[PDB]
Design a protein around this ligand. Structure first.
Ligand SMILES: O=CN(O)CCCP(=O)(O)O
Ligand SMILES: O=CN(O)CCCP(=O)(O)O
Ligand SMILES: [Mg+2]
Ligand SMILES: [Mg+2]
Lengths: 402, 402
């Protein structure tokens, strides 16, 4: 079999993954699961799969330990940064599913990499924030990364085996990769006007909120752009976007003979997770298959970059390097929270992000060696900390009109 | 480099192929070209590429030899069945492009197979008429077959390398192939009624007339169905059809996790031919790439099998085996000629084909061993000869009302 650890097990990615595990008892054993906030769900999961370890936040450690004992469970309870690292570097773990969202997840993904683990990557931060470092660390120690997000996974499925196994192979001209194409639904304001977009908020949210806001601004796709440059070892000019409201075509690889290879699917994350889990093999995933007879019509159009400024910004960030990508993201974080808490207009998200990318204070730190074996991570998190301060300030100043 | 022979070099497939050759002098040398009717074009081609051999029909051998001499050309002139076989089995030929359409091409494709040649298959008859024999012969002697028709080539691109190399691997469950999907444009009477379809003829004809008629009846797709069963080693139930009027999606492979892999392209045959030529490598093909920004909307719907009876018939033929497939095709041939010469209605094509599949006279020969190393080919051509007689009779009887 294969011993698994799911970092961030109480959300969507966790549900989908564990559903497959149930259908495949004989292939995948759970060794560890984690959850920062959702203690009862974490507990429920623990009672079901009997993991050798679990981890939660520092604040919840005591309650969780008390609960774990009140249930008569053999399971070790960890907490915080340290517990994530232990689980990700554990010698009894063969495969890690990195599903923690946010800067708090980097150290464990880096750890899985350090320890040579198979990694099923399911958060954007690992490569948006720690791009060079994650990839360098994986190569050095022989980790394997396999993307789970729908777009990256489609691209990965549509690339020849040699490039799947060694992403730097994409540069040998014989494989004839010309460019990658990311599809994007255009979010909830595709058909609405530039003027209707300056307004809120249940409208903007209609399916998690932040990610749904990112879909409506198109920051999600810029982020995926930055991730793709690292995942598949390209620069941004080689990766283009097409809008595709239906979201049936998950992405495409263009080859130099004119062949576009593409993955089509439903939204069900069990498809990409099953592919990644069983790679190079395939297994039943338990999804309701896409019905080719009921697609009606798949629309495609060019992205309106004036409306979708976050996408231009992200590409601008990708050109500059790890520093501005750190800034792009952290700023988006603060700016999205702001909109959700009704402090800004939807269109200000981009105004704010731009302001931070340009800030003289932020730029002095771009030239730093964020890829460094030894101080890389410190410098990333320091940069993250700095940009929240500035982004927060920026939101303040925007409101008065500065 | 790689020595090539193009059987049937004066049509579309020939043009497209030779265009790629020109862009790639350093990779592909022409050793032979053939052409049954188009003597001057054949000659023009000969004067350009300086082939070591050419072949034409028996009737045109003399004029062509005279012309070849009047041009001061070193080239050997062959003719008929024998000349095709010589070219296809020639030790100086590494790769054969089987582009001859019609029963007259089988012996040379079998010969290429017998001699261990790489074959770029570009006619339907080889597998529709000589399915088991072609595939058995190729395996025994180590020929490699690579389809060039747009649908089969898309499927082939979308199948893992091990199944590309050995089509019987599609049965190991680890590769997780669930089913193949052929796309079909629905031809020129998709939106028109069952009643408007009973009428002709420039309408039915708006590549060639026959193939365009086959598109309008959907016999082309039934034929492709039968070919796919042999190419990819499946039975017909495992291969489904979806109508797709835009013809951007050339076909899809469905995997057990819900992943549909697909090839998108323009109609330009240089795409599939370049893929097949360079396999496993890729090369520039010289096409105007598909423009993802100008697709507007790709429609998909289920095939209307009442209107598209030829498709039901072909699947019925595929169930029975090589005999009924021979009959299906030969009958279609005669029935299409008939329509083109204004002897029948478009809808009678299916009436006629059905009549022949069901004919007691034809059925006695189904149980024959059409796959036999030694008498296989004789029995196929004999069956072809027989079905023209019957189909011709059938057309006669239909007109009076019997
Ligand atoms: O993996 C799926 N997503 O990240 C959701 C994509 C929605 P979008 O195409 O609007 O970015
Ligand atoms: O490869 C190209 N063709 O076979 C033409 C397909 C037209 P159709 O889908 O109507 O059979
Ligand atoms: Mg995504
Ligand atoms: Mg075709």
């Amino acid at each position: 079999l294969q011993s698994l650890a799911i970092l961030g097990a109480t959300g969507s990615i966790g549900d989908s993954t564990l559903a497959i595990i149930r259908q495949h008892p004989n292939r995948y054993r759970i060794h560890a699961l984690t959850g920062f906030s959702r203690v009862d769900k974490l507990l429920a999961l623990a009672m079901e799969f009997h993991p050798v370890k679990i981890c939660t936040s520092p604040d919840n450690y005591a309650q969780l330990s008390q609960k774990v004992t009140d249930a008569g469970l053999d399971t070790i309870i960890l907490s915080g940064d340290e517990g994530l690292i232990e689980i990700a570097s554990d010698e009894a773990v063969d495969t890690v599913v990195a599903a923690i969202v946010g800067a708090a997840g980097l150290s464990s993904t880096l750890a899985a990499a350090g320890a040579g683990k198979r990694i099923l990557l399911a958060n954007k931060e690992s490569l948006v924030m720690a791009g060079d470092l994650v990839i360098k660390t994986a190569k050095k120690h022989g980790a394997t990364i396999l993307p789970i997000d729908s777009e990256h996974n489609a691209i990965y499925q549509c690339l020849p085996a040699a490039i799947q196994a060694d992403n730097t192979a994409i540069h040998h001209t014989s494989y004839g990769i010309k460019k990658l194409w990311l599809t994007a639904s255009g979010g909830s304001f595709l058909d609405k006007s530039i003027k209707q977009m300056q307004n809120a908020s249940v409208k903007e949210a209609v399916m998690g909120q932040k990610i749904s806001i990112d879909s409506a601004t198109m920051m999600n796709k810029g982020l995926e752009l930055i991730e793709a440059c690292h995942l598949f070892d390209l620069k941004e000019h080689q990766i283009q976007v097409v809008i595709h409201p239906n979201s049936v075509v998950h992405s495409l690889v263009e080859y130099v003979d004119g062949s576009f290879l593409a993955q089509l699917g439903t939204p069900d994350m069990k498809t990409p997770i099953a592919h990644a889990l069983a790679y190079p093999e395939r297994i039943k995933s338990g999804v309701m298959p896409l019905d080719l007879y009921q697609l009606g019509s798949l629309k495609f159009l060019a992205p309106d970059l004036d409306k979708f400024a976050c996408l231009k910004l992200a590409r601008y960030a990708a050109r500059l390097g790890t520093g501005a990508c750190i800034a792009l993201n952290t700023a988006n974080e603060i700016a999205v929270e702001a909109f959700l808490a009704e402090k800004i207009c939807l269109t200000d998200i981009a105004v704010i992000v731009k302001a931070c990318l340009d800030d003289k204070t932020i730029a002095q730190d771009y030239s730093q060696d964020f890829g460094d074996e030894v101080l890389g991570l410190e410098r990333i998190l320091t940069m993250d900390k700095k940009v929240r301060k500035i982004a927060t300030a920026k939101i303040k100043l925007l409101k008065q009109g500065d």
